[PDB]
Structure 1
Amino acid sequence: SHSLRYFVTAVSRPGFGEPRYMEVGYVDNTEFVRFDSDAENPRYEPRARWIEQEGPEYWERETRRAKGNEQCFRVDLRTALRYYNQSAGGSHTLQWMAGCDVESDGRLLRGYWQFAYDGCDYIALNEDLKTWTAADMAAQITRRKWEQAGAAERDRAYLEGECVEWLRRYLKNGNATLLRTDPPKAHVTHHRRPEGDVTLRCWALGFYPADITLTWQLNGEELTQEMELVETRPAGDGTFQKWASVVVPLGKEQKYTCHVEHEGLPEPLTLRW
């Protein structure tokens, strides 16, 4: 299972000029292209060494596609002001996520196309890729207007064809970075708590991709209700980090083991203090 994904963002700023229009592209949840209307010489840029192997007609196209979408979003935001009878001097947000997940063979698994206004669901393309789920009366105006235009047919044409065919190519030309696995280096630290007990901290560092499970065991029992977790955080070099902690008494430290399970590990990792 792989995915191609585009996260688009338009933010207004009545009194600072035209809205800041943003696009970020992902393959398997990893960023590889990016667009920002505010950037000096604003244009579609590479965000990974493997996409840099694309010809110039590739970049001119997306820089022009992006800029064309920017022109529409500026209007949408104006359309979503009268839909809600909102003051013209308020800064508002319109987010858009489209993409296509592809099953192990290569044919389309799921196709995405939803919008969000000021952080809430606005409208979305259903799994049938035929019908729209709108969230409120204002989004129902959009829903009917797209049904008469035939939008989903044009929208599905992308998800089932070009979106799939270019994901199948991105995977073929950028495998060495995307499909690489970096095994997490693991280790445990020791911290005396003030209340007399001890906190053990078991770090999982510098690993790709992001999905990991971290657990502490006592005699085989997993200790989920006494574990303190941190969400996975990016090291900033493309790899990630994560630790888990438990509060164990003195002397009994070597009773507890930490079991690291990543996809870059054939067996899990076991560690004590």
Structure 2
Amino acid sequence: IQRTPKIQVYSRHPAENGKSNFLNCYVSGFHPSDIEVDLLKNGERIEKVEHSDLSFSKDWSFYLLYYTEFTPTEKDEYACRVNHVTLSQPKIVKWDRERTHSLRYFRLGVSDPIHGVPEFISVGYVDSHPITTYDSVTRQKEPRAPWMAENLAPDHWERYTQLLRGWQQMFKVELKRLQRHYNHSGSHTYQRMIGCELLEDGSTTGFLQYAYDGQDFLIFNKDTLSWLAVDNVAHTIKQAWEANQHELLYQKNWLEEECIAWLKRFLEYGKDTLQRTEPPLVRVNRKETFPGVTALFCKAHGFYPPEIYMTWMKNGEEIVQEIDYGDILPSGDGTYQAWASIELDPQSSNLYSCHVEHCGVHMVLQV
């Protein structure tokens, strides 16, 4: 099942003409992984374009960010051009107008990529921060964060590069078995996700899952040490794996113990960035796009962690049941932005208000 990319074009900071800024093209929710993204200045490709490394979501969808340094010109027209399997022709999008932590590791396999993209990639994350990276082209596990490279001995990288070289071969072999079993030809994707969550109160959560072509394939239940299979093909794989009772017990123990221990270790190594809280800056704007149309936009920016809650209240008593919302977007500098717009009443004002909650801070912008 293919999924088409969600393309969102926006600036890192609120845009004002003549002031340098960063243009973002957040490309998310797409499957398979192969994509081509360009940023266009007045219809022309931009030579210097930065982009985060390929990232992975828990729904098996892929996400990325493309950014470039620019200064907004009232005349300049910036847009983002995306190529994907689901797009018979490129799609151009104009630029209009904490306490819970998680460690998780993903494995990605692509058969017949026919690209300068690796056959196998594996990335680790603490709270949406890539801590480590490994791929088949590199054949080496390298820290993706600086706080990870200043606390782990070089032997640690050697030891786990050996595990990842073996896991890579297993993924290549396991992927062929699935294509033969399904009689599939061409490029297909194999995905794995393992991780644990450490809640504020001390509770722990764990998960291990496999996906074939972006669809749930095998789900490990660590409470019953069973692999749940979606298909009869997955059932065949389930039977092979469930033979090795030792492997299953290791999964339970790695999730409940080693994973949380690793996570606590990392949350200290990166305490400066991971335990950081940046409060949001909220401004209310009034816009009249058409005659007799007025809307209020509660816009928040520069906060971390991305967990935020925004709402509008008519007369300061009850919530509005017609509130449009904006996605929480990565601005590119480690902070996040969002917005919430309501249609201003043509009648006499109800004295609307905006309410923002972020990490225990409550802001009310009564206008």
TM above 0.5: yes
CA contact (8 A) 1:230 1:244 kept: yes
User: Are 1:52 and 2:149 an aligned pair?
Assistant: yes
SS of 1:29's partner is coil
Deviations 1:19-69 (A, max 9, x none): 52111211133322222334xx45323232321212211222333322221
- Mapped to 2, the partners of 1:17 and 1:240 lie a distance apart of 31
CA contact (8 A) 2:205 2:256 kept: no
Structure 2 counterpart of 1:167: 263
| CA deviation after TM superposition for structure 1 residue 105, in Å | 6.6
SS of 2:278's partner is coil
Q: Which amino acid aligns with 2:344?
A: V
- Structure number with the higher helix fraction is 1
| CA deviation after TM superposition for structure 1 residue 85, in Å | 1.7
Alignment of 1:89-238 (within 5 A): 90-104=186-200, 109-128=204-223, 130-150=225-245, 151-219=247-315, 220-223=317-320, 225-238=321-334
CA contact (8 A) 1:130 1:153 kept: yes
Q: Which amino acid aligns with 1:20?
A: E
- Mapped to 2, the partners of 1:135 and 1:146 lie a distance apart of 15
- Mapped to 1, the partners of 2:154 and 2:199 lie a distance apart of 30
Specify whether residues 32 and 78 from structure 1 end up closer, same or farther in structure 2 by C-alpha distance, changes over 3 A only: same
Give the TM-score taking structure 1 as reference length.
0.88
Aligned CA-pair RMSD: 2.3
Deviations 1:43-100 (A, max 9, x none): 323232321212211222333322221111111111111111222xx11001110012
Specify whether residues 113 and 62 from structure 1 end up closer, same or farther in structure 2 by C-alpha distance, changes over 3 A only: same
CA contact (8 A) 2:284 2:299 kept: yes
Specify whether residues 218 and 99 from structure 1 end up closer, same or farther in structure 2 by C-alpha distance, changes over 3 A only: same
- Mapped to 2, the partners of 1:190 and 1:105 lie a distance apart of 41
The one of 181, 204, 207 equivalent to 1:83 is 181
SS of 2:272's partner is helix
Deviations 1:101-160 (A, max 9, x none): 234476x72221110000111001114051111100000011111111223123223223
Deviations 1:157-209 (A, max 9, x none): 32233222211211222222111110001101111031512011111101100
- Mapped to 2, the partners of 1:183 and 1:252 lie a distance apart of 34
User: Are 1:269 and 2:363 an aligned pair?
Assistant: yes
Q: Which amino acid aligns with 1:84?
A: Y
Give the TM-score taking structure 2 as reference length.
0.67
Specify whether residues 15 and 167 from structure 1 end up closer, same or farther in structure 2 by C-alpha distance, changes over 3 A only: closer
Deviations 1:222-241 (A, max 9, x none): 11x31111111101111100
CA contact (8 A) 2:287 2:295 kept: yes
The one of 19, 33, 37 equivalent to 2:136 is 37
- Mapped to 1, the partners of 2:106 and 2:113 lie a distance apart of 23
Higher relative contact order (CA 8 A, sep 6+): 1
- Mapped to 1, the partners of 2:204 and 2:259 lie a distance apart of 12
SS of 1:86's partner is coil
CA contact (8 A) 2:352 2:366 kept: yes
Specify whether residues 19 and 182 from structure 1 end up closer, same or farther in structure 2 by C-alpha distance, changes over 3 A only: closer
Query: Which of 176-185 and 165-174 deviates more?
Result: 165-174
CA contact (8 A) 2:139 2:165 kept: no
Specify whether residues 253 and 30 from structure 1 end up closer, same or farther in structure 2 by C-alpha distance, changes over 3 A only: farther
Q: Which amino acid aligns with 2:364?
A: T
CA contact (8 A) 1:202 1:245 kept: yes
The one of 57, 67, 71 equivalent to 2:169 is 71
Q: Which runs of 5+ in 2 are unaligned?
A: 1-99
Specify whether residues 138 and 232 from structure 1 end up closer, same or farther in structure 2 by C-alpha distance, changes over 3 A only: same
CA contact (8 A) 2:211 2:218 kept: yes
Q: Which runs of 5+ in 1 are unaligned?
A: none
Alignment of 1:19-34 (within 5 A): 20-34=119-133
CA contact (8 A) 2:118 2:135 kept: no
SS of 1:91's partner is coil
Q: Report sequence identity in percent.
A: 42
User: Are 1:8 and 2:102 an aligned pair?
Assistant: no
Q: Which amino acid aligns with 2:164?
A: A
